[PDB]
Amino acid sequence: GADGVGSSSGNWHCDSTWLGDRVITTSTRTWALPTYNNHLYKQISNGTSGGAT
């Protein structure tokens, strides 16, 4: 079908299966992604100048 705002993209799958010597385990979780560093690559460093050993 033609995908859009109406349809759902994929179906929840969390399951396991035991077949002979095969075992198939699939999982699903819900994630949330915030924006980091205000869209900026930043240099980070630490040294003996500060309290660092």
Place this chain on the structure above:
Amino acid sequence: GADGVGSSSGNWHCDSTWLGDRVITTSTRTWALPTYNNHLYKQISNGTSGGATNDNTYFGYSTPWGYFDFNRFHCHFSPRDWQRLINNNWGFRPKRLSFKLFNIQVKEVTQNEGTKTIANNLTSTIQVFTDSEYQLPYVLGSAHQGCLPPFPADVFMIPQYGYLTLNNGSQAVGRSSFYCLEYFPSQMLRTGNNFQFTYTFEDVPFHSSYAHSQSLDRLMNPLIDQYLYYLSRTQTTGGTANTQTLGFSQGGPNTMANQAKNWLPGPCYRQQRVSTTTGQNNNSNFAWTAGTKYHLNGRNSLANPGIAMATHKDDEERFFPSNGILIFGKQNAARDNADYSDVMLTSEEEIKTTNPVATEEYGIVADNLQQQNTAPQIGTVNSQGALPGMVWQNRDVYLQGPIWAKIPHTDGNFHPSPLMGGFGLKHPPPQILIKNTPVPADPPTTFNQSKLNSFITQYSTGQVSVEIEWELQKENSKRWNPEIQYTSNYYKSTSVDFAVNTEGVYSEPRPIGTRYLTRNL
């Protein structure tokens, strides 16, 4: 066509159909699903540590999920149809059912200051799955509240799902089992989706609706004598000095109580009798003390209702067994300590033929062994198990009553007819689960491992439609005189039965038994 926000998923269907011995009744209702437990599986328990008595101690969990329960008849049958069914048909059983779920909406609500507002959230989803393999604790069959409302215009809230497990005190033992519902395959739907599935019932005997025009003991010919003899006389008579002797006579019209008989009444487990007349009853509160109870695992349990029996004998209608009968509350009856006038009592009188009266003993047997030296004695059996050659009737079903119950899976069972009445099943219709998909709030910028406890307040509504094809067993009988039927009262009323009141609150003035037509033993 290509489905989307523009189109409607499915069309409203509430209808019935009568074809030969088939009758197909499908319904539709409008449902609303709130979010439960803030998306958290929670341990629940109660024990003697609190005010709980030892019997009501439990251990279990309350899931965020929710389920659909159509198990009650008045979902699927208008009173009118339920009038035709019981008048013209001996028996019936279900065959196959269909289920559709469609036209989902999702709405996110906020509280700002002291005001509320609501808007359509398009992208959000909900989860649905059905356990075909019965891999979950099966919670239906206890006739909990929250089935589909009888009067279709109503809109009902979906109950919350939960279950109980082995408990010791308020604590739990090793065999205690725990579940995670998100661990199953489940289909996810947005506003542009629908969900449907089919099911078939296993072969189950037609529920009998009828009363026996005869009585179990009177099957004899009234005119003709039997050729068997019974012991009619232990003592000489008419003399000034009487001695023991043996004497016999044939069973005949005059004395029918002595005649041979081929069958026995059903089993009996006695109940205490209670009058609807207050003054007649003992003055005390005996309900829980005198209540007929059974004991399991060091834990007392009331037997509710108990096995099918006659409610009362001739003209005793003002009398009823303690817990023996089902009860239905009238509309807007008080939940607790409701007075008699607010509830509606079923009557089993139709089965007095085959089954014993609930308030009386099964029979009498001799306790001791007689001699020329000894006087014989008798004894009273209040509780009698099953014996060869017994026949019995199941308990009646009612327009409000539950349709089926899942037969527990055990080594073995005896005559699996659910006590509350219905169709016992090895494989009931699979229970359906549904939940809102949790959508986080704004997470922090700095990382943290702790799961996000904050959410958008959210709920979702839509349509649900259910189809059932009922098979019938037609009535064929040569009885001459007119039958008893179920009719509405002719005389005038302030308002019509089974119709909305002044305020549009639908109500059912009385329960409806299933047995009217007559058959012959």
